[PDB]
Amino acid sequence: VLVGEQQQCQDAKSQQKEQMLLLEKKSAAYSQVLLRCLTLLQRLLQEHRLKTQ
Amino acid sequence: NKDVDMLCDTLYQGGNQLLLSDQELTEQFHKVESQLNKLNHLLTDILADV
Numbered sequence: 646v647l648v649g650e651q652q653q654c655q656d657a658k659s660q661q662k663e664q665m666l667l668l669e670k671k672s673a674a675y676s677q678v679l680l681r682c683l684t685l686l687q688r689l690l691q692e693h694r695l696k697t698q
Numbered sequence: 699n700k701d702v703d704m705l706c707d708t709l710y711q712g713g714n715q716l717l718l719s720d721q722e723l724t725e726q727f728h729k730v731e732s733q734l735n736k737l738n739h740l741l742t743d744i745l746a747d748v
Contacts, residue, residue, distance in 0.1 A: 679702060686705035689716070694709065698718045 711717050 682702045689709050694718045
């Protein structure tokens with residue numbers, strides 16, 4: 646019973662690292678998507694609307 | 699994300715289709731063209747009569 650208790654106790658602490666890395670990498674992926682959106686929107690405003698139009 | 703949001707809001711201006719041209723300026727061009735067409739129709743009628 647206490648071996649099972651210790652194993653289930655240590656499982657969450659060993660688990661949490663990979664979700665930390667997962668949220669970190671998806672957080673960086675969000676930054677990449679936002680950078681691409683910023684580039685496309687500045688292309689739409691400056692090149693397509695501000696100067697040419 | 700906020701930058702993307704008001705950039706999208708500024709470029710769309712409430713329309714699903716993109717608005718590169720100034721919309722009220724665009725309809726000003728359209729009404730100038732339509733009134734010019736009406737004046738041209740009257741002028742061509744007068745030319746035909748002459």
